[PDB]
Design an enzyme around this catalytic site. Structure first.
Site, PDB file in Angstrom:
ATOM      1  N   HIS A   1       0.813  -1.347  -0.090  1.00  0.00           N
ATOM      2  CA  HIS A   1      -0.125  -0.060  -0.146  1.00  0.00           C
ATOM      3  C   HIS A   1       0.945   1.050  -0.135  1.00  0.00           C
ATOM      4  CE1 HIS A   1      -3.459   2.546   1.005  1.00  0.00           C
ATOM      5  NE2 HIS A   1      -2.736   3.135   1.415  1.00  0.00           N
ATOM      6  N   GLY A   2       0.556   2.201  -1.112  1.00  0.00           N
ATOM      7  CA  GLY A   2       1.246   3.405  -1.179  1.00  0.00           C
ATOM      8  C   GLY A   2       0.474   4.720  -0.885  1.00  0.00           C
ATOM      9  N   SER A   3       0.828   5.487  -0.428  1.00  0.00           N
ATOM     10  CA  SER A   3       0.055   6.904  -0.101  1.00  0.00           C
ATOM     11  C   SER A   3       0.832   8.111  -0.363  1.00  0.00           C
ATOM     12  CB  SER A   3      -0.813   6.737   0.989  1.00  0.00           C
ATOM     13  OG  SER A   3      -1.784   8.025   0.931  1.00  0.00           O
TER      14      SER A   3
ATOM     15  N   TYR B   1       0.899   5.369  -6.295  1.00  0.00           N
ATOM     16  CA  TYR B   1       0.121   6.060  -5.376  1.00  0.00           C
ATOM     17  C   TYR B   1       0.842   6.960  -4.432  1.00  0.00           C
ATOM     18  CZ  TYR B   1      -4.165   3.840  -7.177  1.00  0.00           C
ATOM     19  OH  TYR B   1      -5.318   3.497  -7.871  1.00  0.00           O
TER      20      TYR B   1
ATOM     21  N   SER C   1       1.562   0.124  -6.054  1.00  0.00           N
ATOM     22  CA  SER C   1       1.198   0.928  -4.887  1.00  0.00           C
ATOM     23  C   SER C   1       2.230   2.132  -4.867  1.00  0.00           C
ATOM     24  CB  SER C   1       1.421   0.274  -3.517  1.00  0.00           C
ATOM     25  OG  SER C   1       0.562  -1.050  -3.674  1.00  0.00           O
TER      26      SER C   1
ATOM     27  N   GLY D   1      -1.044  10.182   9.100  1.00  0.00           N
ATOM     28  CA  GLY D   1      -2.222   9.637   9.285  1.00  0.00           C
ATOM     29  C   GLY D   1      -2.425   8.088   9.469  1.00  0.00           C
TER      30      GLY D   1
ATOM     31  N   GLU E   1      -5.982  -6.244  -7.415  1.00  0.00           N
ATOM     32  CA  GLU E   1      -6.561  -5.379  -6.588  1.00  0.00           C
ATOM     33  C   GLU E   1      -7.213  -6.077  -5.357  1.00  0.00           C
ATOM     34  OE1 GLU E   1      -7.157  -1.774  -8.653  1.00  0.00           O
ATOM     35  OE2 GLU E   1      -8.420  -1.152  -7.209  1.00  0.00           O
TER      36      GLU E   1
ATOM     37  N   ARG F   1      -7.846   3.205   6.977  1.00  0.00           N
ATOM     38  CA  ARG F   1      -9.202   3.526   7.565  1.00  0.00           C
ATOM     39  C   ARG F   1     -10.224   3.482   6.381  1.00  0.00           C
ATOM     40  NH1 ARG F   1      -5.532   7.023   9.036  1.00  0.00           N
ATOM     41  NH2 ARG F   1      -6.246   8.497   7.726  1.00  0.00           N
TER      42      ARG F   1
HETATM   43  C1  LIG Z   1      -9.872   7.938   4.485  1.00  0.00           C
HETATM   44  C2  LIG Z   1      -8.349   8.086   4.974  1.00  0.00           C
HETATM   45  C3  LIG Z   1      -7.528   7.804   3.847  1.00  0.00           C
HETATM   46  C4  LIG Z   1      -5.906   7.996   4.388  1.00  0.00           C
HETATM   47  C5  LIG Z   1      -4.975   8.287   3.125  1.00  0.00           C
HETATM   48  N1  LIG Z   1      -7.594   6.761   3.038  1.00  0.00           N
HETATM   49  C6  LIG Z   1      -7.803   6.359   1.749  1.00  0.00           C
HETATM   50  C7  LIG Z   1      -8.626   5.418   1.572  1.00  0.00           C
HETATM   51  N2  LIG Z   1      -7.950   4.062   1.696  1.00  0.00           N
HETATM   52  C8  LIG Z   1      -7.653   3.104   0.728  1.00  0.00           C
HETATM   53  O1  LIG Z   1      -6.976   2.356   0.997  1.00  0.00           O
HETATM   54  C9  LIG Z   1      -7.930   3.478  -0.770  1.00  0.00           C
HETATM   55  C10 LIG Z   1      -6.874   3.646  -1.764  1.00  0.00           C
HETATM   56  C11 LIG Z   1      -7.217   3.795  -3.234  1.00  0.00           C
HETATM   57  C12 LIG Z   1      -5.931   3.841  -4.147  1.00  0.00           C
HETATM   58  N3  LIG Z   1      -4.622   3.116  -3.932  1.00  0.00           N
HETATM   59  C13 LIG Z   1      -3.731   3.768  -3.015  1.00  0.00           C
HETATM   60  O2  LIG Z   1      -3.798   4.921  -2.578  1.00  0.00           O
HETATM   61  N4  LIG Z   1      -2.672   2.895  -2.588  1.00  0.00           N
HETATM   62  C14 LIG Z   1      -2.326   1.613  -2.871  1.00  0.00           C
HETATM   63  O3  LIG Z   1      -1.530   0.986  -2.498  1.00  0.00           O
HETATM   64  C15 LIG Z   1      -3.714   1.094  -3.890  1.00  0.00           C
HETATM   65  C16 LIG Z   1      -3.298  -0.406  -4.296  1.00  0.00           C
HETATM   66  C17 LIG Z   1      -4.427  -0.902  -5.211  1.00  0.00           C
HETATM   67  C18 LIG Z   1      -5.574  -0.107  -5.460  1.00  0.00           C
HETATM   68  C19 LIG Z   1      -5.451   1.268  -4.886  1.00  0.00           C
HETATM   69  C20 LIG Z   1      -4.685   1.774  -4.181  1.00  0.00           C
HETATM   70  C21 LIG Z   1      -8.434   4.041  -3.836  1.00  0.00           C
HETATM   71  C22 LIG Z   1      -9.426   3.876  -2.654  1.00  0.00           C
HETATM   72  C23 LIG Z   1      -9.216   3.689  -1.381  1.00  0.00           C
HETATM   73  F1  LIG Z   1     -10.206   3.478  -0.524  1.00  0.00           F
HETATM   74  C24 LIG Z   1      -7.563   3.970   3.142  1.00  0.00           C
HETATM   75  C25 LIG Z   1      -7.360   5.360   3.912  1.00  0.00           C
HETATM   76  O4  LIG Z   1      -7.228   5.184   4.944  1.00  0.00           O
END
Ligand SMILES: CCC(CC)N1CCN(C(=O)c2cc(Cn3c(=O)[nH]c(=O)c4ccccc43)ccc2F)CC1=O
Length: 351
Positions: A198-200, A243, A240, A207, A328, A214
């Site tokens: 997971h990457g953000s 992202y 990931s 957070g 996914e 979350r």
């Molecule tokens: C509400 C608080 C915020 C805090 C940041 N939040 C955001 C929602 N969320 C997710 O996991 C989430 C991620 C994506 C996009 N996506 C990503 O971003 N990284 C990945 O590796 C990834 C790997 C495969 C597919 C999509 C990926 C889309 C929808 C989601 F719901 C958990 C969370 O806590």
């Protein structure tokens, strides 16, 4: 005064940098001067989510016209953008909603970060030790010759997607993650426990570490989530890593490897934002891709299936332009997640 490991100070330094936060928001065209991130409130972020659902209501109901522009006008008022010369554009596709969701998502974790960094001013604690304490999440570095570092490095390089050929990834640092209350709440008895990626964005790492991964808020429009309001994981490192939104300028990112107890998967071939309703007993949604690692080349690191391997075609069809190029994984309950490792990643762009 007296702190902690020099590699952890460098981690805390990177994620508690609000200057970089103030910049990431301008690259998403958010007027940080009209609304300083210091005076960010969950009520205004809630209000923006609601207006996004209003915008969605007009799109899905075919009520374009003014009712859409009235909703965008409201969203743009409570969430101040900065396009400068032109009128802020309408939001008429799910791509634009899903982009504004990220702005709000990042704008939410910036509230958490500024709140946390503005906490105790204890004279008996170096500032980078207070932040680490307020995180309530262990971050202990691993030896570069350690069993975990070796398998995680192979996981990163062996599952770099062939279609993400604009950068290379270099593991600068590997920290072990332990968020308070995550082991005790984990569905440690459910099968198909996998170490997934997971990457953000950078602004979101205070957070995800202090609050865990979350479920999307109730006020968010569900059409921004290709498989429902869950926690999204990938078995492909670069999927990931994309992202993280690493920049040519700022070529550092954080990747998270978590234990994900998937159980039985409700495998979908084409995206469906109502995918949580299709579970009906099953414990996760598996977005089927046309290319993924193979069960033979897998290993097990400390209890969990590590989806190693070069990866090849899956035979997955549904002739349609939304055939996922890579798999996914979605879980709709934080108890199916246990944050376990953290990677400091250097992106080496090739273009
Ligand atoms: C509400 C608080 C915020 C805090 C940041 N939040 C955001 C929602 N969320 C997710 O996991 C989430 C991620 C994506 C996009 N996506 C990503 O971003 N990284 C990945 O590796 C990834 C790997 C495969 C597919 C999509 C990926 C889309 C929808 C989601 F719901 C958990 C969370 O806590």
């Amino acid at each position: 005064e007296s702190q902690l490991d020099l590699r952890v100070q460098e981690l805390i330094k990177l994620i508690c940098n609000v200057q970089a936060m103030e910049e990431m928001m301008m690259e998403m065209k958010y007027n940080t001067k009209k609304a300083p991130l210091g005076k960010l409130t969950v009520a205004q972020i809630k209000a923006g989510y609601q207006s996004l659902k209003k915008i969605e209501d007009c799109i899905r109901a075919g009520q374009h016209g003014r009712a859409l522009m009235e909703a965008c006008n409201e969203f743009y008022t409570r969430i101040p953008h900065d396009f400068g010369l032109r009128t802020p554009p309408l939001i008429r596709t799910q791509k634009e909603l899903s982009e504004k969701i990220q702005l709000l998502e990042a704008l939410g974790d910036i509230e958490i970060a500024i709140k946390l960094v503005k906490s105790e001013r204890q004279g008996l604690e170096h500032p980078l030790d207070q932040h680490y304490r307020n995180l309530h999440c262990a971050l202990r570095p691993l030896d570069h010759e350690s069993y975990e570092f070796k398998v995680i490095s192979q996981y990163l390089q062996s599952t770099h997607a062939p279609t993400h050929s604009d950068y290379t990834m270099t593991l600068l640092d590997l920290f072990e993650v332990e968020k308070d209350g995550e082991k005790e709440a984990f569905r440690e008895d459910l099968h198909n426990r996998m170490l997934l990626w997971h990457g953000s964005r950078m602004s979101n790492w205070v957070g995800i570490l202090s609050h865990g991964l979350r479920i999307a808020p109730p006020e968010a429009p569900i059409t921004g989530y290709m498989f429902g309001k869950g926690i999204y994981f990938a078995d492909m490192s670069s999927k990931s890593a994309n992202y993280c939104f690493a920049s040519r300028l700022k070529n550092t990112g954080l990747l998270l490897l978590s234990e994900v107890a998937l159980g039985q998967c409700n495998e979908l071939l084409e995206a469906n934002p109502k995918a949580e309703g299709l579970l009906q007993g099953k414990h996760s949604t598996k977005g089927l891709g046309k290319m993924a690692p193979s069960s033979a080349h897998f290993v097990t690191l400390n209890g969990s299936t590590v989806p190693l391997g070069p990866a090849s075609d899956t035979g997955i069809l549904n002739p349609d332009g939304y055939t996922l190029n890579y798999n996914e994984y979605i879980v709709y309950n934080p108890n199916q997640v246990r944050m376990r490792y953290l990677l400091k990643v250097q992106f080496n762009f090739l273009q």
